[PDB]
C-alpha cells in the first residue's frame, strides 16, 4: 500500500549516505529508528545529545548505536565557527551571548548544523510543538528561490491510490499568492514520490458556479501560478467532484486540463485542508504521511508527538529524498 | 444503505398526504417524480406553469398526471389575493405592479402558496440556481423563531453509517454566532431522520491546540450554543480525529461530551464544508443527499439542476416530513 511507497523512496536515498540529524537524541522512538537507519545503511543519522546519557539510553532499549554520531552542544567544537554563523544570518537580531544560548538548543544546534553543511537535513518534532521545528528552519535554513513560505504537503495513498493534499499543516490563511505557490511547490513534492503533477486548486464552486472573495481568491490564485509555471498541467476553482470523478469534469467544467483526473489537490485554507485530508484518512481508509514541509532550502520536517518509530524512519526516508 | 434511511422518512410521511409545490413544471425529472409520488398516493403534488403544455409534455415522457394538480399563474383564481399579500409582506419594498410581475415568477408563485397555506412546502432547483429558489423563500416565507439564516446540511451514509453535515451549500463565511446557530439547526434536521444528536463544531485544532481567530470563532460558537441549548450534547473545536476516532477523543480532549462519537459536524466555512461532503462521498464512498435547507417557517428544499429524477422524489420526502 503506502509501503510499496516508501521502498521507492528508500530506493533513491539509500547508499548515498546522506546525513540526517536528529535533535531529539534522548527519545526513544527516534533511537529505535536511528539505530536501524545506521544498522542497515540506509543513510548517516546524527542524533544530538549528551554522549553517555544517549549510549545508556540506547543499551535499556537493547539497541546500538552502529553508525550513529553525537553532537552535544555543550561539548561541540565547531561552536563559536556556529555562534558566529548564526549572529551573521540573523542580521544583527542576535547578540553574541543570545546567539550562544540559542545554540544550546539542540532544535538550533542541528539546524545551523544542516545549514553549515555538516548534515544535510533536520528531523525533529516527537517531542516539541511543530513550531519549535519550523521556527528555527526559517530564521537560520530560509526558503528557496522564488518560494516565500512552506506548507505542509500529506501523500494520500490506498492500494494503488497516491495523491498529494495542499497545506493542510502550516498556512493558516494563505491568500492568491500563497495559494499559487502551494499548488507549483506541491507538485515538485510530488515528482519525489514518482507522481505526475496535475493539480487542481479546490474550492466550493467550480470554475465559475458561486462568485464571492474566496472563490476569486482561488481563481486569481491559478492565473498566478498557470502565469508562472505554464507547464505545470494545474486548472483553477474545482469542487472535490469536478476535480475526482471525470464524469462531473466534463458537465461542471470541460475545456480544461484537468479531466477529473486531478493527483495533487490544493486546498483554499488550513480550516478545509486539515479537515481534509483527516476525513480522506479516517472515513476514506486512506493511509496518510504526517506533515512533510517543503520550498526550504534544506530538508527539514516534523514529527508528531506521540509518533511512531517506524514514523521517524519513514520521515527520514523523505527528509533525505528532499536533500538527494 | 441510505435507501433504509428514506423508507424512515416515506414511513412519516405517506397518508398525511402533505401538498408540495414544484414551480418547474415542464421539468421532466419533476414531472416523473411527480408523476410517481402522486401515484402512489404518497403526497399531493401541485406542480405550476401551463396545464395543456404540462399535460402535453407528461405525454411524451409516458406519464399521467393523475392525483396531480396543476396551478398557472396567469390563471389562478386567488391571483389577486396573493399579489396583495406580497406587497404586504413586502413591507412596503413592492409596488403593485412589480407585485404582480413578481408573483408571475413560478418560485415566487409556488412560494407565495406555501406561504398562505395552500400548500405546505415548496421544491425547487432543478432549472434554477439555489440563489433563485433561497430567494423568495428569504423574502416571503422567512426564518423560524430564533433563527436569523438558513444553512445546509447533508445527510450523510454509508451502509449503517449516518451523520449530518453542517452548512456546505448556503452561508460563505459563518461567524461564531452563524456557526452556534448553523449547530443547534443541524441538530434538529438530525432528528427528523431519526439520529441521536451530538454535535461537534469542527477546526484545524482540538481544545486549544492552536490559537487563531479562526480557532476563537468556532470556540466562541461553542459557548453561545451550550448557553442557548445547554441539554444538546455538543462540545467544540474539534479536529476531526477529536471528532471521530475514540483514540484520539482521550488523547486530544478528554473530559468532553462528545468522546470520539460525533454524528453531527458542524464545520467552521463554506470552504471546508463543500469540499468536507464531497471528499466524504467520493473518497468515503460515502452517499450524500443534497442540500436541504433548514430552520425557515416552512419547508424550502433546492435540487441541482441535472439531479436524478429519484432525486426530486426523495427531496419530496424529506421537504415533507419537514412539514408535517
Same mark, same amino acid.
Given at each position: 500500500g503506502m509501503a510499496d511507497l516508501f521502498s521507492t523512496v528508500q530506493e533513491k536515498v539509500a547508499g548515498k549516505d546522506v546525513k540526517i540529524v536528529f535533535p531529539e537524541g534522548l527519545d526513544e522512538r527516534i533511537l529505535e529508528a536511528v539505530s536501524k537507519l545506521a544498522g542497515n545503511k540506509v543513510l548517516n543519522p546524527i542524533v544530538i545529545g549528551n554522549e553517555n546519557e544517549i549510549q545508556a539510553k540506547a543499551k535499556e532499549l537493547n539497541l546500538t548505536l552502529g553508525g550513529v554520531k553525537i553532537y552535544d552542544p555543550? /561539548?561541540?567544537?565547531?561552536?563559536?565557527?556556529?555562534?558566529?554563523? $548564526? &549572529?551573521e544570518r540573523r542580521k544583527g537580531?542576535? /547578540?553574541?551571548?543570545? #546567539?550562544?544560548?540559542?545554540?544550546?538548543?539542540?532544535?538550533?544546534?542541528?539546524? !545551523?548544523? &544542516?545549514?553549515?553543511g555538516l548534515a544535510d537535513g533536520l528531523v525533529s518534532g516527537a517531542a516539541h510543538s511543530t513550531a519549535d521545528t519550523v521556527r528555527p528552519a526559517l530564521q537560520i535554513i530560509k526558503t528557496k528561490e522564488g518560494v516565500k513560505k512552506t506548507s505542509? &504537503?500529506?501523500? !494520500? #495513498?490506498?492500494?494503488?491510490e497516491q495523491y498529494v493534499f495542499a497545506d493542510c #499543516?502550516?498556512?493558516?490563511?494563505?491568500?492568491?499568492?500563497?495559494?499559487?505557490?502551494? #499548488?507549483i511547490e506541491?507538485?515538485?513534492?510530488?515528482?519525489? $514520490?514518482?507522481?505526475?503533477?496535475? &493539480?487542481?486548486?479546490?474550492?466550493?464552486? /467550480?470554475?465559475?458556479?458561486?462568485k464571492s472573495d474566496e472563490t476569486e481568491k482561488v481563481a486569481d490564485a491559478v492565473k498566478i501560478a498557470k502565469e508562472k509555471a505554464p507547464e505545470l498541467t494545474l486548472d483553477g476553482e474545482f469542487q472535490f467532484d469536478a476535480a475526482f470523478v471525470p464524469s462531473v469534469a466534463e458537465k461542471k467544467a470541460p475545456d480544461s486540463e484537468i479531466k477529473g483526473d486531478a493527483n495533487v489537490f490544493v486546498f483554499p485554507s488550513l480550516e478545509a485542508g486539515n479537515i481534509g485530508y483527516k476525513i480522506a484518512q479516517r472515513l476514506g481508509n486512506f493511509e496518510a504521511v504526517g506533515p512533510i514541509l517543503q520550498g526550504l532550502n534544506m530538508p527539514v520536517n516534523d514529527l508528531s508527538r506521540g509518533c511512531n518509530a517506524e514514523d521517524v524512519y519513514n520521515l527520514a526516508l523523505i527528509t533525505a529524498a528532499q536533500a538527494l
Open positions: 555543550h /561539548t561541540y567544537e565547531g561552536m563559536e565557527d556556529l555562534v558566529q554563523a $548564526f &549572529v537580531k542576535a /547578540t553574541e551571548e543570545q #546567539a550562544r544560548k540559542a545554540l544550546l538548543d539542540e532544535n538550533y544546534f542541528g539546524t !545551523m548544523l &544542516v545549514y553549515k505542509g &504537503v500529506f501523500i !494520500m #495513498a490506498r492500494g494503488e #499543516a502550516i498556512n493558516i490563511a494563505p491568500d492568491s499568492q500563497d495559494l499559487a505557490e502551494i #499548488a506541491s507538485a515538485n513534492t510530488a515528482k519525489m $514520490f514518482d507522481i505526475e503533477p496535475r &493539480v487542481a486548486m479546490l474550492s466550493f464552486s /467550480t470554475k465559475g458556479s458561486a
